[PDB]
C-alpha cells in the first residue's frame, strides 16, 4: 500500500482499456422480476463482478472451495463483491468526442495548443463548417475554416489536393498532424524580431506548453476521446429503498444516454444513412459525453425528473460538496457524540462532566476488553449483552477504563486550536455535559443551550497527545497573543471585586488582626465587613536572585476581605497584588504574573481557587438588579432641552438657506453626539461618587455600591456604553446603510422607548443581526484563504544562521502610546548586538531570547527601536527556524521543532475577524462614532517637531500646512518622541517648527467636515475649463445675489467636458500667471468632484486663502465589517485605483517633455547614465519639485502605496512592515490582539515566488517565475562550482494565487478551482510528492509535522540511504 508520490496524465485510448474488464454494450441495468445484473449491462456481473461474496450469478460456484474460478455458464468470476467498486469498464465510441475539460476550461488547451480560436473549434464539432487539416497545395491555408458553400468550391476545383474535414474527427486529425518539435523551434526563432509584452507572454506560454507536452509523454491526440471509461457499479449504486422502490445515481442516467446514442450511431453507420442523420447523432453523442463528464459547462445542463440537473462526474470532484472538501479534508467519526452543555463550577480545570450512558456507548470496545480480562464474559457477544443489560458489574468496569483516560471536547465553530480541549472525564448522573467555567472563553461557549462534540482518543499515542498537548491545563495562554485565555469572568470577577473593595468604617474599622485566618474568623463570626479598613499581619514571600524564596513579614493596611483573598494567593507573589480592589483586568494580570514567576502547576491551582472563592463570595454578596438601581441624572431633561434648541437653530438656518444639507447633517450629529456624552458623564458622575456616607469622624464620600455600577466597573458584564441605554440616553441609532439617523433616541430602557423610538431602534437591530447571519461568511472565508496559503509551513531548523531582521519602532500613535516597544519585541531573538545608549559596552547578545527580565532592562536604558529576527528574513529553504519565529506565545517558551506555525498564524488572524462579526451585532443596538477631531492639544511640554511638512504663512499670521501626510511629534528634555499625531492638510498651527509649547495647548486647529484647497501664491483667481453646464453648476438667491459654483465629476458630467479638467488658476493684477516660488509651475489648483466654490471669477486673494471646499461625508461607524475588506485586499496584494508614484533608481532628476497635460520624467541617475522614463497623469500634483537628489522609493505622487512598488524598490523588510502596520491598524481599531509574527508568517508565504531576470545554468533562463527556495539551492552550488550566475527579483503574491502556485496540485485542487487545477496538472504530467499537511490529511497518513515530524524525517533518511 505504502508509496512515494502520485502522478497525473491524460488517459491513452490504450490506457482506458487496461482499467476496463469488459465493454458495457447495453444501457440495461437489472431484470425487473429476477433482480440480477443484465447481459453486458451497466451493472454487469460478468464485467464488474458478483453481487454476493464468492458467488456467481447462476449459483454454480459458491464459497472459497472455488477460489479463482470463472463460471463458464453465466461468465462470472467467483471473487469478493469488493471487486465491484474497483474494476472499471469502457465504451468503444463509434466516433471521436472532445473532452470538455480540455476544451472549455480556459485556457482552451486544445485551442491554445492549435493557436486556433475556441469558436472556430466548436463550429467544427457541431458540424457548421469544415476545417483544413493539411492543404496539399498551400492555396488552402491550414486551420482555415471553410463554410459548407466554401467547401463545395474547393471540392470541384481541387478535390484530393486538400484534406478538409468536419466533426471531432477533424480536430483529432488536426492534433495528430501537428509536430511539437518543429512548431516550437519556429516560435522561439520568430519571437526575436518583435519582442513586445503580450506576444512574448502568449508565445512563451505556447513554448512552455509545447515543451511540457513533450516531457509529460502526453499526446495532443488524447485531448479527443475515442474510448470512454465507465465508473464501477458500487460507486454509482442501484440499491433498494425499504418498501420496493429503488434508487440510483445520476451517473447511471448519464451513462445510459451515452450508450443509447453510441449504439444507435453504430446502427446508422451500419445503415449507410445520409450524413444529415449521422451528423445529428454525432452532435447528440458529443452532448451526452460532455454532459457525463461536466454537466453544466458546455451548454444548459441536462435535467432529470426533479427539474434539477443530473450530477456529473466533475461535480463529485469539484468544490464544496466534492470528495475533497467534504469526504477527505474532513470526515464523520466513530467513537463520537454530543449533547447540551451545562456548568460544572465544582470541577477542576482539568475535568469535564461526561454522562453515564454517553460514556458507556463511547467506550464499548474497552469494556468488552476489560470484561474478558477479569473473566466475567467468555466472548464478545456475551460481553455485548452484559453491557446492554447495564449490569451493576459493568458500571464498575466502565469507571475503571475512564480513570486517567482523557476525552476531547469540541464546539462549533472551530475558529482556533483551543476550539478543542482535552479533559479527564467525570461520570455524572444526568444526560448533559458539564463544562469548566474558565475554558468557556476559548470555546466562546455560553450555557443558553450550546452543544459540544465528544471524541475518544483510542490509541495510547492519542491518550498521550490528549494529555501532553491538548489538555486544558497545558493550554492557558492564547497562541494569538501571549496573554491568558483562561481568565475568570461574570460571577467570579464580581466576587473578588466585592471582597477586595473597601468601604467607610463598616463593621470593625481600624482593628488589628494576627493573620489572614483571624480575618476569616471575624467575617464568618460576624464582627467585620469584608470592606473594613484594618491593619493585618501578612507574610509575603518574594523571590531572590537565586531560585530561593525570601520570606518578609509586615503590617498591611488592607480590608478584612483582602486579607482573606491572600489565602488563595500562592507564595511567590507580593501582597501588593491583592491590596488593590480587583477587577477583570487586574485578575488577568494576576495569573499572567503567576505564570511567569512560579510556573504551570501553581497557576492551574491558583486559577481554580480564584474561580472557587470568586463564585462563593459573589453568592454571599447577594448582588442584584432592581429598577431603582438604574439611576437617571436629575438634569437629563435640562441637557436635552438645551441640545434640542441648538439643533433647531441649524435647521432654522437651513430653511433660510445659510447652511447646506450635508453640512447640517454632519453638524447636527456632532451636537447630539456630544449631548449623549454630556448625559452619560452626568449619569456616571451621579452614579459613581453618589454614595455619601457618615464616618465615625463626620461625613465623606466613596464610590457607589449601586449593584449595576459594580457589575460594569468590575468588568463582570456590561460596560458604561450599555448603562447609557439603561439609565442615560440611548443615542444615535445607525441606518441599515451604516450612515447615522439624524434623530437619535432621547429616552433609555428604564423610562421606556415610545412607538417611534422603537421603530427607529429596529433599523439598527435588524442590520446587526443581519451581519451575524451574512457577513460572518466573508470573514470565515478569510480564515480559509489564510490557512490554505500557510498550511505547509513548519519549524524545520533550530537556527538558520541568518543575520537579518525587521527594525521595530514602538507604535506611538495619537497622544497615548498604543503599543510599547516591549510588547512588540517580547519573545524575539535580537537580530543584531543591541546595546545601551553609550555605545561602549554590548547590553544584549545577538542570538538570545527576550524574556520579560530583558524587556524590563530595555525600558531602564530606554532602548528606542530594536532590530528583531523575523520569519520573513529566515534563510531556511525547507520551512522556518525556531530562532526567527521565537517564543510560542501560547507556551511562553522557545517554539519546538515540528510545530505547525502556518496554521496557527492563519487561525489567529482569521478568528477575531470571524467571531467579532457575530459579537457587536447581536449586542449592537446603536451607532457610536465620534470622528469630530477638530484640534490637537499637546499634553506634556515639548518642542514642536513636524516631519514630511511643507507649510506657507497666510495674511492672518498663521502657519497653514500645504502637505497631506504631516506628522506632529512631542520632543522631551533629552530628545525622544513621546506623543504623535496626524496634522491634516489646510490646518492652522498655533506654533511652527521648533517652537516651545506648554502642556494643554492647542498646537493645531482645523475644520473636520471639509477638506479645503489652499493656495501657495497671492494675486487674483482665474476660471479655467469652468464652462457652466458641462463641468460645473450654479445657484443664486435674492436682492443682491450670492452664487456658489459646484464642480461636477464624471458621474454628473456630460460627454462634452470629459477631457476638460476644472481648476482655479492664480493670476496677478496685470492678468498674467503667478509662478510658485522657485519653480516653473504657473499656479493652478485642480478642483475634484463635488467641490463647492464660493469665490467667483475675478476675486483678490492672499497666500493661505481657501479656494474651494471638498465635502468630507463619512458618517459610518467602522466595525469589523467596514475594515475587514481592507485586510482581505492587503493580504491579496491589490493595487489601489490610484497608486502613488515612487522613484525607481537613486539619482539626479530632470523633468522632460509633455503629452497634452500628461507629464514625463526622463530621470538620469549619477552612476547609472542610462535613463528611466515614465508617464504621469495630468491631475497629479507632485510632491517633488524636480532637479533634486531623489533616492529609491521616494513619494512623488501623494496617495496610497501598491505593496508591489514597496517590495520592488525598498526590499522585503519594507513591504512586510507596510502589510503588518496596515492590517494591524484595522484590528487595533477594534481592540483585537494579534502578534506581528502571525501576519509575518503569511507575508512570508506571499513572498514565495520570484522571477528570474538574467540567464542561469539550468533551465530557468528568462521570464520563468520559480519559487525562492529552489533558485537559492541552485545558487549554493553555482557560487562554489561556478558557471553563469542567475540574477533574480523576489515577486509578491496574493493569498488565493500563492496557494494555487504551490507545486502540490493536491493542495491546489483541494483549495479552489478544482476543474482547472486537475487539467493543467494532467497536461504537464505533474507529480505531487505529498509535501504539506493537506496532502497527508487527504491520503490518511501521519502529519509531516507535530508529533509525526520525527517519523516523516526518519522515512526520509531511509530514502537517502541507498
Amino acid at each position: 500500500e505504502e508509496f512515494d508520490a502520485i502522478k497525473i496524465a491524460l488517459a491513452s485510448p490504450d490506457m482506458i482499456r487496461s482499467w476496463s474488464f469488459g465493454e458495457v454494450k447495453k444501457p440495461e441495468t437489472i431484470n425487473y422480476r429476477t433482480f440480477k445484473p443484465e447481459r453486458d449491462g451497466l451493472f454487469c456481473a460478468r464485467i464488474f463482478g458478483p453481487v454476493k461474496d464468492y458467488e456467481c450469478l447462476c449459483g454454480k460456484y459458491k464459497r472459497l472451495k472455488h477460489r479463482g474460478v470463472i463460471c463458464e455458464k453465466c461468465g462470472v468470476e467467483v471473487t469478493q463483491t469488493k471487486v465491484r467498486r474497483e474494476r472499471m469498464g469502457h465504451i468503444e465510441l463509434a466516433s471521436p468526442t472532445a473532452h470538455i475539460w480540455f476544451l472549455k476550461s480556459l485556457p482552451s488547451r486544445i485551442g491554445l495548443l492549435l493557436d486556433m480560436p475556441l469558436r472556430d473549434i466548436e463550429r467544427v464539432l457541431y458540424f457548421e463548417s469544415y476545417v483544413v487539416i493539411e492543404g496539399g497545395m498551400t492555396n488552402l491555408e491550414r486551420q482555415q475554416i471553410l463554410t459548407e458553400e466554401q467547401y463545395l468550391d474547393a471540392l470541384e476545383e481541387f478535390g484530393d489536393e486538400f484534406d478538409a474535414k468536419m466533426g471531432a474527427e477533424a480536430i483529432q486529425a488536426l492534433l495528430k498532424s501537428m509536430d511539437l518539435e518543429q512548431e516550437c523551434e519556429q516560435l522561439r526563432e520568430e519571437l526575436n524580431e518583435t519582442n513586445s509584452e503580450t506576444k512574448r507572454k502568449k508565445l512563451t506560454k505556447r513554448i512552455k506548453l509545447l515543451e511540457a507536452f513533450v516531457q509529460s509523454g502526453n499526446k495532443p491526440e488524447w485531448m479527443i476521446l475515442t474510448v470512454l471509461p465507465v465508473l464501477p457499479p458500487d460507486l454509482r449504486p442501484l440499491v433498494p429503498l425499504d418498501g420496493g422502490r429503488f434508487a440510483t445515481s445520476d451517473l447511471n442516467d448519464l451513462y445510459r444516454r451515452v450508450i443509447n446514442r453510441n449504439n444507435r450511431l453504430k446502427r446508422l453507420l451500419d445503415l449507410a444513412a445520409p450524413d444529415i442523420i449521422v451528423r445529428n447523432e454525432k452532435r447528440m453523442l458529443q452532448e451526452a459525453v460532455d454532459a457525463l463528464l461536466d454537466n453544466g459547462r458546455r451548454g444548459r445542463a441536462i435535467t432529470g425528473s426533479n427539474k434539477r440537473p443530473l450530477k456529473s462526474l466533475a461535480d463529485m470532484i469539484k468544490g464544496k460538496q466534492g470528495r475533497f472538501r467534504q469526504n477527505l479534508l474532513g470526515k464523520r467519526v466513530d467513537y463520537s457524540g454530543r449533547s447540551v452543555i451545562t456548568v460544572g463550577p465544582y470541577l477542576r480545570l482539568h475535568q469535564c462532566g461526561l454522562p453515564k450512558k454517553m460514556a458507556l456507548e463511547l467506550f464499548k470496545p474497552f469494556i468488552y476488553g476489560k470484561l474478558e480480562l477479569r473473566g466475567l464474559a467468555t466472548t464478545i457477544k456475551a460481553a455485548k449483552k452484559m453491557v446492554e443489560r447495564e449490569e451493576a458489574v459493568v458500571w464498575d468496569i466502565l469507571d475503571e477504563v475512564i480513570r486517567e483516560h482523557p476525552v476531547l471536547l469540541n464546539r462549533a465553530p472551530t475558529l482556533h486550536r483551543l476550539g478543542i480541549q482535552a479533559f479527564e472525564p467525570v461520570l455524572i448522573e444526568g444526560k448533559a455535559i458539564q463544562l469548566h467555567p474558565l475554558v468557556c472563553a476559548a470555546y466562546n461557549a455560553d450555557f443558553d443551550g450550546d452543544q459540544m462534540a465528544v471524541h475518544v482518543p483510542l490509541t495510547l499515542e492519542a491518550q498521550l497527545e490528549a494529555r501532553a498537548l491538548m489538555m486544558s491545563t497545558n493550554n492557558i495562554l492564547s497562541p494569538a497573543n501571549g496573554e491568558p485565555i483562561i481568565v475568570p469572568s461574570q460571577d467570579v470577577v464580581l466576587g473578588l471585586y466585592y471582597m477586595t473593595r473597601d468601604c467607610v468604617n463598616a463593621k470593625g474599622e481600624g482593628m488589628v488582626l494576627t493573620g489572614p485566618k483571624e480575618a476569616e474568623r471575624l467575617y464568618r463570626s460576624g464582627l467585620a465587613s469584608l470592606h473594613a479598613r484594618v491593619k493585618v499581619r501578612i507574610t509575603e514571600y518574594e523571590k531572590d536572585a537565586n531560585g530561593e524564596l525570601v520570606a518578609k513579614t509586615s503590617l498591611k493596611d488592607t480590608t478584612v476581605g483582602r486579607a482573606i483573598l491572600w489565602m488563595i494567593v500562592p507564595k511567590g507573589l507580593p501582597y501588593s497584588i491583592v491590596n488593590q480592589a480587583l477587577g477583570k483586568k487586574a485578575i488577568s494580570k494576576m495569573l499572567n504574573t503567576c505564570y511567569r514567576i512560579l510556573g504551570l502547576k501553581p497557576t492551574v491551582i491558583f486559577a481554580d481557587q480564584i474561580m472557587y472563592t470568586g463564585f462563593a463570595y459573589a453568592a454571599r454578596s447577594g448582588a442584584s438588579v432592581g429598577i431603582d438601581d438604574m439611576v437617571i441624572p436629575e438634569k437629563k431633561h435640562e441637557i436635552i432641552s438645551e441640545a434640542e434648541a441648538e439643533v433647531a437653530e441649524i435647521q432654522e438656518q437651513f430653511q433660510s438657506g445659510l447652511v447646506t444639507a450635508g453640512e447640517r447633517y454632519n453638524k447636527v450629529i456632532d451636537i447630539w453626539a456630544a449631548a449623549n456624552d454630556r448625559v452619560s458623564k452626568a449619569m456616571m458622575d451621579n452614579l459613581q461618587t453618589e454614595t455619601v456616607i457618615n464616618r465615625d469622624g463626620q461625613e465623606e464620600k466613596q464610590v457607589s455600591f449601586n449593584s449595576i455600577y459594580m457589575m460594569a466597573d468590575s468588568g463582570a458584564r456590561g460596560s458604561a456604553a450599555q448603562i447609557r441605554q439603561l439609565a442615560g440616553m440611548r443615542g444615535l441609532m445607525a441606518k441599515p446603510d451604516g450612515s447615522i439617523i439624524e434623530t437619535p433616541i432621547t429616552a433609555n430602557f428604564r423610562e421606556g422607548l415610545n412607538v417611534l423610538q422603537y421603530f427607529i431602534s429596529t433599523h439598527g437591530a435588524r442590520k446587526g443581526l443581519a451581519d451575524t447571519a451574512l457577513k460572518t461568511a466573508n470573514s470565515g472565508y478569510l480564515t480559509r484563504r489564510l490557512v490554505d496559503v500557510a498550511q505547509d509551513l513548519v519549524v524545520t531548523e533550530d537556527d538558520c544562521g541568518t543575520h537579518e531582521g525587521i527594525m521595530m519602532t514602538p507604535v506611538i500613535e495619537g497622544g497615548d502610546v498604543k503599543e510599547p516597544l516591549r510588547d512588540r519585541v517580547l519573545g524575539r531573538v535580537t537580530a543584531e548586538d543591541v546595546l545601551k545608549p553609550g555605545t561602549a559596552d554590548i547590553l544584549v547578545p545577538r542570538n538570545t531570547l527576550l524574556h520579560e527580565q530583558w524587556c524590563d532592562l530595555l525600558e531602564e536604558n530606554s532602548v528606542d527601536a530594536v532590530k528583531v529576527r523575523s520569519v520573513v528574513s529566515c534563510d531556511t529553504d525547507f520551512g522556518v527556524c525556531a530562532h526567527c519565529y521565537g517564543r510560542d506565545l501560547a507556551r511562553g517558551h522557545i517554539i519546538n521543532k515540528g510545530e505547525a506555525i502556518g496554521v496557527i498564524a492563519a487561525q489567529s488572524i482569521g478568528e477575531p475577524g470571524t467571531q467579532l462579526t457575530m459579537r457587536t451585532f447581536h449586542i449592537g443596538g446603536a451607532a457610536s462614532r465620534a470622528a469630530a477631531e477638530s484640534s490637537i492639544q499637546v499634553k506634556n511640554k515639548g518642542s514642536i517637531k513636524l516631519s514630511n511638512v511643507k507649510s506657507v504663512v497666510n495674511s492672518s499670521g498663521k502657519l497653514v500646512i500645504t502637505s497631506r501626510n504631516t506628522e506632529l511629534k512631542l520632543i522631551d528634555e533629552f530628545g525622544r518622541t513621546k506623543e504623535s499625531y496626524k496634522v491634516p492638510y489646510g490646518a492652522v498651527l498655533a506654533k511652527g517648527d521648533g517652537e516651545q509649547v506648554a502642556g494643554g495647548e492647542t498646537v493645531a486647529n482645523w475644520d473636520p467636515h471639509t477638506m479645503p484647497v489652499i493656495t501657495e501664491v497671492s494675486g487674483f483667481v482665474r476660471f479655467t475649463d469652468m464652462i457652466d453646464g458641462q463641468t460645473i453648476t450654479r445657484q443664486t438667491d435674492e436682492l443682491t445675489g450670492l452664487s456658489s459654483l459646484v464642480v461636477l465629476d464624471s458621474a454628473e458630467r456630460t460627454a462634452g467636458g470629459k477631457d476638460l479638467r476644472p481648476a482655479l488658476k492664480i493670476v496677478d493684477a496685470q492678468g498674467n500667471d503667478v509662478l510658485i516660488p522657485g519653480t516653473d509651475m504657473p499656479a493652478q489648483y485642480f478642483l475634484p468632484g463635488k467641490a463647492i466654490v464660493q469665490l467667483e471669477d475675478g476675486v483678490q486673494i492672499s497666500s493661505g486663502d481657501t479656494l474651494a471646499r471638498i465635502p468630507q461625508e463619512s458618517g459610518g461607524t467602522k466595525d469589523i465589517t467596514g475594515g475587514l475588506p481592507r485586510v482581505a485586499d492587503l493580504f491579496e496584494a491589490r493595487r489601489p485605483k490610484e497608486p502613488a508614484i515612487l522613484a525607481e533608481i537613486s539619482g539626479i532628476v530632470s523633468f522632460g517633455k509633455e503629452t497634452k497635460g500628461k507629464r514625463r520624467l526622463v530621470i538620469t541617475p549619477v552612476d547609472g547614465s542610462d535613463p528611466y522614463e515614465e508617464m504621469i497623469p495630468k491631475w497629479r500634483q507632485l510632491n517633488v519639485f524636480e532637479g533634486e537628489r531623489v533616492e529609491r522609493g521616494d513619494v512623488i505622487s501623494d496617495g496610497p502605496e501598491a505593496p508591489h512598488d514597496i517590495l520592488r524598490l525598498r526590499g522585503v523588510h519594507a513591504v512586510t512592515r507596510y502589510i503588518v502596520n496596515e492590517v494591524q491598524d484595522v484590528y487595533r481599531l477594534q481592540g483585537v490582539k494579534i502578534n506581528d509574527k502571525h501576519i509575518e508568517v503569511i507575508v512570508r508565504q506571499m513572498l514565495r515566488k520570484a522571477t528570474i531576470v538574467n540567464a542561469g545554468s539550468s533551465d530557468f533562463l528568462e521570464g520563468e517565475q520559480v519559487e525562492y527556495s529552489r533558485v537559492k539551492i541552485a545558487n549554493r552550488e553555482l557560487e562554489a562550482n561556478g558557471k553563469v550566475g542567475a540574477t533574480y527579483s523576489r515577486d509578491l503574491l496574493g493569498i488565493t494565487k500563492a496557494s494555487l502556485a504551490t507545486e502540490s496540485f493536491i493542495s491546489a485542487a483541494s483549495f479552489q478551482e478544482t476543474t482547472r487545477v486537475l487539467t493543467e496538472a494532467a497536461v504537464a504530467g505533474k507529480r505531487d510528492e505529498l509535501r504539506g499537511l493537506k496532502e497527508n490529511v487527504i491520503v490518511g497518513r501521519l502529519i509531516p509535522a507535530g508529533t509525526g515530524y520525527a517519523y516523516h524525517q526518519d522515512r526520509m533518511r531511509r530514502r537517502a540511504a541507498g
Binding site: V625, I627, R717, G718, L726, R750, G925
Partner: protein
C-alpha cells in the same frame, strides 16, 4: 423557585424582565392577601373593598 444570574441583564439590555418580576411580585402579593382573607374567612363586604 428559580435563581437567575443578574449579570444576564445589563449586557442583554432587556429590562422588561425585571419590570415583569417586580409587577409579578406585586400581583402575587395581592393573591397572597386574598388567599389569607379567604383562609381567615373575613367578610364578603371586606373582599369587595380590597
Amino acid at each position: 423557585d428559580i435563581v437567575l444570574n443578574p449579570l444576564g441583564v445589563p449586557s442583554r439590555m432587556n429590562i422588561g424582565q425585571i419590570l415583569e418580576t417586580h409587577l409579578g411580585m406585586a400581583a402575587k402579593g395581592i393573591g397572597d392577601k386574598i388567599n389569607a382573607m379567604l383562609k381567615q374567612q373575613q367578610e364578603v363586604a371586606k373582599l369587595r373593598e380590597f
